From a paper:
Next, we determined the structures of PBP3 and SpoVD, at 2.40 Å and 2.20 Å resolution. Both SpoVD and PBP3 possess a canonical class B PBP fold that closely resembles Pseudomonas aeruginosa and E. coli PBP329,30. Like PBP2, the four residues in the Zn2+-binding motif of [name] PBP3 and SpoVD consist of an invariant His, a Cys from the X residue of the SXN motif, and two electron rich residues—in this case Cys instead of Asp. Importantly, we find Zn2+ binds in an almost identical manner as PBP2, suggesting Asp and Cys are interchangeable at the first and second position. The significance of the Asp → Cys substitution between SpoVD/PBP3 and PBP2 is unclear. Whereas the redox-sensitive cysteine in the SXN motif for PBP2 can potentially function as a sensor for environmental oxygen levels, the replacement of Asp for Cys in both sporulation specific [name] (PBP3 and SpoVD) may further enhance the sensitivity and/or subject them to additional regulation. Subsequent biochemical analysis of purified PBP1, PBP2, and PBP3 demonstrate PBP1 and PBP2 are selectively insensitive to most cephalosporins, in contrast to the non-essential PBP3 which is potently inhibited by all β-lactams. Nonetheless, SpoVD and PBP3 are very promising drug targets.
Residue numbers in the entry: 55 to 197, 216 to 554
The structure:
Amino acid sequence: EKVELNSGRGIIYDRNNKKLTDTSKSQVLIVEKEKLNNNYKILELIKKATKMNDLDIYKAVQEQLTRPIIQIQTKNIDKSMKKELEKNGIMVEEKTMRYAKDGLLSHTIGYIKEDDKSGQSGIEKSMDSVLRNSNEKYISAFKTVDNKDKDRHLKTTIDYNIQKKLEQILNKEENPTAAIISEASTGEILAMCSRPNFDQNDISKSLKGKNGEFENRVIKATYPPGSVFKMVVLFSALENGVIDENYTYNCTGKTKVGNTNEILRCNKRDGHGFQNLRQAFSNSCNPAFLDIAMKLGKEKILKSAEKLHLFEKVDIGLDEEKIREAPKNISIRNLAIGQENIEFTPLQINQMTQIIANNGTFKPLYLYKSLVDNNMNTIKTYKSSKKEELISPYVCTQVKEYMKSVSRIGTAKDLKDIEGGCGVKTGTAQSSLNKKAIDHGWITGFYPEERPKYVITVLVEGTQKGNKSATPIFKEICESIK
Ligand SMILES: [Zn+2]
């Protein structure tokens, strides 16, 4: 009879060699079933040591009815109680559970089947071929446990501390959210969080749940970009030479859509007035961006989107990434305002923001660094399949400069005062939950303003109870990682 001291799977580590699985030490008390069932001394000895009761014990007994030896999960058995129990034929072993109670990085890590130990989602499934039976710790019963030179573990790009801070923040939001933080200069993913959460230790209780408790909204959920798309129209316009830094537009609060008497109102309604490019972008002025879009056309804007990696998978090492194809036909109006049949995951928006933030040096977003041994020595390097590109660096630097204005005297002025500044673009997605008009809140940008280290993307889903801005959560993130 085999006693499992761990899941047998390769540990998952963060970028700094801190464990993200296999963190909480616990105990497995092992007793012969006949001895337990026929001898009140042994029952009452186990009860004392575990602090369990008869119901807890005989639940365990009933689950292992057929086995000649019974294994009880417990903890905090000191040394006297340990030798004591061994005098009574009861051996106690130090064990490691796969997932803490903390449950950091749930959707990204995923979960395993308990019989099989096989990966069912996230990293556990995408990297099951290298992690399964790569770290086997077990004893044989009716009475090896320690390291082996061929043990393999997976080291990721995640920063445990940044991940913790982000989960603290999204845990205070009742609305479903998606948040990703990546390194501007390398594309390494420092943190990813989706809400609502699931319990990796209780796949049953969550599966009955109704709100996508198992959806990685960062990599799977697509949303309309709203004004976030003005990064692309602004990029497209400056790259195609249709506008320059000297563009002025007079927002009177409305405009005719091309040649028709179809009318697009501004959000100000009484108008922004005379705007330079910085103000048109900062004010998120729909009429100014229709004016800019009309000068480009559908195809130049889509090619610009394609060039910024919005019409392909980011391919970060997780296979369940979903995307939505470029629309067959869409009105230049819906392009300008970023609504209808154009949608992106937060992962894609983050990748696009990485390029702008990094002055056109595209670093493909990725989650894995290496497969390591028990000494944390590199056995092999992992990296993106994607080729590095230098993309319109000058244009990228212009969009990036204008994004520093949005934070200071724009739609996201509440960020004017954060230590070190930031560059952002906010936006609102228009969806439907039931047939009610529901609004999802976007913000994307980089922190700090001057030499960005972080590319940050947040999406707060609307609910029947109402819609929310992403700006507050972006602010808390920046305040918690200064
Ligand atoms: Zn306007």
